[PDB]
Amino acid sequence: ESADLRALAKHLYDSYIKSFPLTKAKARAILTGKTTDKSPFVIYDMNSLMMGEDKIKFKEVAIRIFQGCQFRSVEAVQEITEYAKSIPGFVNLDLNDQVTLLKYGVHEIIYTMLASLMNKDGVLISEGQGFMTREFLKSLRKPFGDFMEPKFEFAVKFNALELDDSDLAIFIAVIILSGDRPGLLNVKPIEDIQDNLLQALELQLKLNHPESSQLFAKLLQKMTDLRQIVTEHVQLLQVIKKTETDMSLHPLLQEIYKDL
């Protein structure tokens, strides 16, 4: 029954709005500078960065940025975990599997949702109060200048799908309930949940984007781009650990990160 699938879509969208304070709808309102209810402050060089603290609520500059990214990721992990517990069936899973599903799903979600905050010229920061240009980030000293480029490239393509928050809420639930994560103890109940989530996403895209042929398939193919961003980023962090011997990765992020 599609009524049951529409009910699940509504439930997940409701829970997404409650869990993620900065939605895509709000990010696009900020970025499309027609909606000038509150415009962001734009950080494009070293002096604009230095004035950003004077307006936004805010040791090398590449480092200070890198820690802002980590801190935002820690906050995102907390939001995703709260979202995860609303996915019907998730909290009834073996706790070791719950932990495993979050450990591998969190970064794929973070870059999915980071795309909502991006256009081809930069990224919103600090709850949309700021905008950091892609050029400025690319100008950071090695290896920090290479950190953000594959995210922008992913986002440009991902954003061409024109998903909205109600689509993304189900897609993110599909990502979390992936039965193919390493170390899972009971794959079958995870797969049963993901099958129902996939039926829901499929109907959602049909109803919400009836003119977008094979959007469902094109979205599922994006899960390949996501896994590739994660791998690249893990290697980039290993270079950081060896050159930045005075730099600390947040312990929550440290725990999530386990290579291979």
Q: Which residues are annotated as a binding site for rosiglitazone?
A: 70-73, 107, 233, 257
Which residue is at the shortest CB distance from ligand GEV?
A: 68
Strands in 41-43's sheet, in edge-to-edge order, are 41-43, 130-133, 122-125, 118-119
Q: Is 184 in the site for ligand GEV (CB under 6 A)?
A: no
Smallest separation, CB 156 to ligand GEV (Å) = 14
H or E element, residue 117:
none
Inter-helix orientation angle 24-31/165-176, to 10°: 130
Instruction: Provide the angle, in degrees to the nearest 10, between the axes of the packed helices 165-176 and 2-19.
Output: 90
- For the window 230-249, what string marks contact with ligand GEV as x by the rule CB under 6 A? --------------------
Query: For residue 192, what are the CA distances in angstroms to 2, 103, 186, 204?
Result: 17, 20, 11, 19
In this structure, which amino acid lies at residue 24?
Answer: K
The residue range among 3-11, 68-76, 187-195, 217-225 that interacts with ligand GEV, by the rule CB under 6 A, is 68-76
Residue ranges in 122-151 that form contacts with ligand GEV under rule CB under 6 A: 123, 125-126, 132, 137, 148
Q: Closest distance between ligand GEV and the C-beta of residue 71, in Å?
A: 7
Residue 223 near residue 108 (C-beta atoms within 8 A): yes
Residue with tokens 């440009």: 156
Q: Residue 69 or 197: which CB sits closer to ligand GEV?
A: 69
* Nearer Cβ to ligand GEV (65/177): 65
- Residue 107 or 222 having the CB closest to ligand GEV: 107
Binding site, annotated residues: 70-73, 107, 233, 257
- 157 is written with which tokens? 């393509």
Does 102 bind ligand GEV (CB under 6 A)? Our answer is: no
Task: Give min distance, CB of 151 to ligand GEV, in A.
Answer: 6
Tokens of 172: 């993110």
How far apart, in whole angstroms, are the C-alpha atoms of residue 260 and residue 205?
33
Q: Where along the sequence are the contacts to ligand GEV (CB under 6 A)?
A: 58, 65, 68-70, 72-73, 107, 110, 114, 123, 125-126, 132, 137, 148, 253
